[PDB]
Amino acid sequence: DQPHVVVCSGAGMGHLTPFLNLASALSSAPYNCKVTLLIVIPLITDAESHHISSFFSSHPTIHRLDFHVNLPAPKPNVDPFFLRYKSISDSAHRLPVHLSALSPPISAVFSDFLFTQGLNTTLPHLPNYTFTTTSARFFTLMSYVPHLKSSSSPVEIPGLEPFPTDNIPPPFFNPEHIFTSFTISNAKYFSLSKGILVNTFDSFEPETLSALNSGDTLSDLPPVIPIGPLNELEHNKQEELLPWLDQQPEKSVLYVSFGNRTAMSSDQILELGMGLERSDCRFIWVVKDKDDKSELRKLFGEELYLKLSEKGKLVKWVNQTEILGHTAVGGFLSHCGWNSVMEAARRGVPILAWPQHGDQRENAWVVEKAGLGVWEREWASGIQAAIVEKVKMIMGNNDLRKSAMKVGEEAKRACDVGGSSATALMNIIGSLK
Numbered sequence: 001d002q003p004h005v006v007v008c009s010g011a012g013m014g015h016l017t018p019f020l021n022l023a024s025a026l027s028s029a030p031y032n033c034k035v036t037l038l039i040v041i042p043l044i045t046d047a048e049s050h051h052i053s054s055f056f057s058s059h060p061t062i063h064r065l066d067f068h069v070n071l072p073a074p075k076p077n078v079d080p081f082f083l084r085y086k087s088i089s090d091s092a093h094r095l096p097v098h099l100s101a102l103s104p105p106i107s108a109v110f111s112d113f114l115f116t117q118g119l120n121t122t123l124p125h126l127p128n129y130t131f132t133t134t135s136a137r138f139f140t141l142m143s144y145v146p147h148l149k150s151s152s153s154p155v156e157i158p159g160l161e162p163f164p165t166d167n168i169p170p171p172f173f174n175p176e177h178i179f180t181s182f183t184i185s186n187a188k189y190f191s192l193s194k195g196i197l198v199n200t201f202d203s204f205e206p207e208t209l210s211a212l213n214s215g216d217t218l219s220d221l222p223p224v225i226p227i228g229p230l231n232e233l234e235h236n237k238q239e240e241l242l243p244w245l246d247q248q249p250e251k252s253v254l255y256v257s258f259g260n261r262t263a264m265s266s267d268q269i270l271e272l273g274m275g276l277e278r279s280d281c282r283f284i285w286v287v288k289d290k291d292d293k294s295e296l297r298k299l300f301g302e303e304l305y306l307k308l309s310e311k312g313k314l315v316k317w318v319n320q321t322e323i324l325g326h327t328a329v330g331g332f333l334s335h336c337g338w339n340s341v342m343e344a345a346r347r348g349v350p351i352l353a354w355p356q357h358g359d360q361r362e363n364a365w366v367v368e369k370a371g372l373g374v375w376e377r378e379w380a381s382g383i384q385a386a387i388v389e390k391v392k393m394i395m396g397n398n399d400l401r402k403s404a405m406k407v408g409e410e411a412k413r414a415c416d417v418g419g420s421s422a423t424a425l426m427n428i429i430g431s432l433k
């Protein structure tokens with residue numbers, strides 16, 4: 001009686017992570033499905049491949065299905081990942097033969113946005129749940145892209161707060177930019193998906209979600225269903241910073257990380273370093289071979305590098321979830337990629353938001369609206385002052401600490417028994433039996 005479901009992931013670490021979390025959750029109680037996880041190969045980065053094989057090693061019950069799509073040749077002035085995304089969207093029409101061979105016959109697919117057109121035209125009788133990896137707020141923008149036909153005036157979707165022009169990726173106004181092309185092709189088929197799953201929870205984006213599900217946006221979207229707080233994955237490889245964290249005072253450490261996609265120049269990193277050193281706060285900072293200091297000594301110079309190392313840790317990689325969950329961490333300076341927002345929210349960690357792109361600026365606004373954090377809109381205009389001023393607020397202001405804590409309590413409730421997200425996901429799986 002146990003449903004066989006397919007999780008159809010795309011490319012790029014930020015998009016794979018929630019799909020791996022979802023596959024893990026569905027293969028486990030209380031869902032207890034048989035899960036086939038589809039991987040698009042070949043993988044673009046070594047990090048992606050590393051994380052996937054580690055996932056299957058630690059989740060032996062989940063079946064791996066490789067979907068080979070030829071890598072496109074690189075082009076001058078075209079983002080490699082966009083070319084890869086486009087490659088993947090263009091091959092989704094091939095999925096039917098591969099998904100139909102699976103045994104036992106599958107009950108549903110949970111798919112990346114890039115597969116939407118392929119799945120919903122070629123497999124119209126199979127429930128397809130489109131799983132977006134962004135905020136409900138930014139997803140709404142993406143679904144409206146076919147209707148953008150003013151390149152420089154805010155976009156007003158009915159029932160939602162307008163999207164200011166400087167938070168919209170400028171490609172969105174050119175129908176033939178490569179990113180816009182596969183965005184339009186797949187958003188045009190959202191109407192045929194059984195639902196849109198979002199890694200968010202009702203109390204985190206209540207006005208966006210109620211507007212979407214009341215009909216106010218006047219879209220033909222299916223129901224938009226928050227399923228998050230998604231449970232994060234156990235990494236066997238242990239975090240070498242947890243004993244050091246155990247010796248810092250509660251809520252005294254600022255965690256600094258700008259994601260997989262960071263667009264920060266050496267000069268920006270240097271000013272951030274100068275700013276953190278002047279703040280004298282303790283910190284863990286992911287900058288950019290894990291044991292190499294030499295680049296950091298070159299970047300900061302010896303005196304600043306040593307002053308920074310007296311108070312914090314400059315590292316290449318951490319188990320983010322383990323760091324954010326530690327009692328000693330009092331704040332999170334983040335680019336506001338949606339995975340990092342959700343992880344932080346799950347832990348009630350106040351966020352200082354320095355977004356770099358369009359979806360991150362919208363996510364930063366969601367973070368501020370929920371009381372999870374504060375968005376420094378012009379952080380790039382004065383990096384040292386922005387960090388000196390706001391770190392003392394992120395780590396000392398009791399109102400933001402208490403509102404971020406309530407966000408964490410609501411995030412825990414949502415993914416607990418009877419929570420709004422757990423119920424939603426259980427009703428989907430129950431509908432398959």
Ligand SMILES: O=c1ccn([C@@H]2O[C@H](COP(=O)(O)OP(=O)(O)O)[C@@H](O)[C@H]2O)c(=O)[nH]1
Pocket residue numbers: 013014015017257258259260261286316317318319320321336337338339340341343
């Ligand atoms: O040292 C690190 C830095 C980041 N992350 C993870 O990388 C992801 C970043 O995704 P996000 O959406 O936040 O940003 P993106 O990389 O896509 O820009 C998160 O899940 C983090 O937990 C991590 O595990 N260790």
